[PDB]
Nucleic acid binder design. Structure first.
Lengths: 72, 71
DNA sequence: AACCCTA
DNA sequence: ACCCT
């Protein structure tokens, strides 16, 4: 199949700070490049939820960008 | 460098990822090269932890996506 | 350490 | 489909 998906990641606050970036410049790149709908749960909480939604090519791009950021 | 990623998955999807007798997750652990843990019990949302080099985590994640897209 | 977002 | 650190 080629159905749209919704993938949710449970992330530590520190990691989320890196994904968002100063002024949200990192997640802006992820949204503009991946084609995924990306939602990051509200508040600088110890644990946060990142939602990725779209077809597999978009999910793969966003997930790749997230793990690449975290590897930094 | 090694990362740990946690996916939040509904029980229905976890059943598919595990597979009958754990056959599916077994295959994922063997060829992905990642450590894969699926949370115990029956919470509406389960946690699938993927651990190892980013390449192994990505491979495991790809196998999961493939499973969700089956048939 | 970063706080964004078809609100 | 319920695996197994």
């Amino acid at each position: 199949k080629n159905v749209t998906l919704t993938i949710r990641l449970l992330m530590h606050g520190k990691e989320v700070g890196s994904i968002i970036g100063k002024k949200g410049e990192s997640v802006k790149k992820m949204r503009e490049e991946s084609g995924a709908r990306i939602n990051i749960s509200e508040g600088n909480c110890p644990e946060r939820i990142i939602t990725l939604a779209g077809p597999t090519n978009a999910i793969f791009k966003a997930f790749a960008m997230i793990i690449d950021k975290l590897e930094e």
